[PDB]
């Protein structure tokens, strides 16, 4: 999560309840102390309403027992699944477009075959008239 003012990972994260957005505590508090407004919605906001997020000590202890393998694994099962879903969606669209194209191409091929045979007939007739 990134602070919406700084675009950096906050060192003391807070949630504005108005914008439902994470900010750096100092930045948000100072902005409110100057303007009295939420920096995204421009709604009135008070320092008491700001919900400071606590970085849980449990979060640290949970990133301990997640094996170094699983933190070095630049994969998450959610992200893997979503990638597989996006692939499936894309391949479904591709197969649809393939079918539609193949049908159009069959109809076109039939048309061109009729045109070829008509050209051959005109040519043969002109040749016959030239030899007589």
């Amino acid at each position: 999560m990134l602070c919406a003012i700084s675009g950096k990972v906050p060192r003391r994260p807070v949630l504005s309840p108005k914008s439902r957005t994470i900010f750096e505590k100092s930045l948000l508090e100072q902005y409110v102390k100057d303007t009295g407004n939420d920096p995204i919605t421009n709604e009135p906001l008070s320092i008491e309403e700001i919900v400071e997020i606590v970085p849980s000590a449990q979060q640290a202890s949970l990133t301990e027992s997640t094996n170094s393998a699983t933190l070095k694994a630049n994969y998450s099962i959610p992200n893997l699944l979503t990638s597989l879903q996006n692939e499936w969606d894309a391949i479904m669209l591709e197969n649809f477009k393939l079918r539609s194209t193949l049908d159009s191409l069959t109809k076109k091929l039939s048309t061109v075959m009729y045109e070829r045979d008509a050209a051959k007939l005109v040519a043969a007739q002109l040749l016959m008239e030239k030899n007589e």
Partner: protein, 67 residues
Amino acid sequence: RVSLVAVPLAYSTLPIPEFKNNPQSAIDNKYNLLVANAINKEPHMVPEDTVDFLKEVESRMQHITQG
């Protein structure tokens, strides 16, 4: 002077077909010549008169294909 004009082959978006190994007719020779030109990327040059005879041939072909 016979002005030569390049016949635009409408098939630029399609893969060049193979040569006919036994060209039994003038049509098949013309086909092989078109294929050779496409392979070489050369335009198929025809006399300027031939383009008007092509338009008339297309008019006859239409009457045939309407059956």
